[PDB]
């Protein structure tokens, strides 16, 4: 045992698209990232010893957009007010499980599955140990038990849908932050997740040149 299955609700979520990001503004992805629900796992229970993989999402909800006036936070700003599109309404389900960090070896001590998996699923019993946020400060949402696939989702028997490339998440520091791609489909409202190792783009994110005509 070393798995999590949860749902996620919020009002409102911000996953950035971040090719959206000119001007002040920001419009959300359709879905979540890999990166934004490992995140959110981590904010039921976490310790450096284990290391969350998100296997699956399902979406609960029709994808539906919202704009807003906003004043974004950031150092030396006063230059808004700017116009921020957010997803409204959102429901997923998410099926994950933990891993033991191999490149912590002064943790092997730690490595302990059933010290790991009860005391993550008593937090989640409890909706977690740190503010749940869908992408964003100002998009609080929160998290409970479910069993992965229960109940009717807005997407039931909808086929494929083509989400377009998305951002996976970020490989920190071997030496230098890459970012991975992939292409994100969803298929009668389930998202499978590549494993980060596996996703067909990666490179260090340090060009205006690819969107060149």
């Keep these: 045992r070393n798995e999590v ?3 996620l609700f919020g009002d409102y979520a911000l996953f950035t698209d971040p090719l959206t ?8 992805y359709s879905v979540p990232t890999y990166q934004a629900l490992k ?3 981590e904010s039921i229970y976490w310790k450096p010893t284990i290391v969350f ?22 150092y030396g700003g006063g230059n808004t007010l700017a116009h921020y599109t957010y997803l409204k309404d959102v429901h997923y389900q998410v099926k994950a499980h933990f891993e033991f960090n191999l490149h912590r070896p002064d943790l092997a001590f730690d490595r302990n599955e059933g010290k790991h998996y009860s005391i993550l699923q008593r937090s989640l019993k409890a909706g977690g140990r740190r503010d749940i946020f869908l ?3 100002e998009c609080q949402g929160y998290v409970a038990p479910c069993e992965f696939g229960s109940g009717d989702g807005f ?3 909808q086929g494929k849908y083509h989400l377009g490339t998305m951002v996976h998440g970020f490989n920190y520091p071997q030496h230098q932050l890459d970012v991975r791609l992939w ?7 389930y998202i499978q997740f590549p494993r980060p190792e596996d996703c067909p783009i990666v490179r260090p994110v340090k060009e205006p040149k690819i969107f060149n005509p």
Aim: net charge negative; aromatic share 4%.
């Design 155 to 157: 997407y039931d028997g």
């Design 39 to 41: 995140g959110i796992a």
């Design 5 to 7: 299955q949860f749902e």
């Design 183 to 189: 292409s994100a489909v969803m298929e009668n409202g």
């Design 53 to 74: 993989v998100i296997d699956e999402l399902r979406v609960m909800k029709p994808i539906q957009m919202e704009s807003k006036g906003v004043r974004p936070i950031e």
């Design 135 to 137: 992408g964003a400060r």
């Design 21 to 28: 990001k000119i001007g002040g503004e920001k419009l959300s």
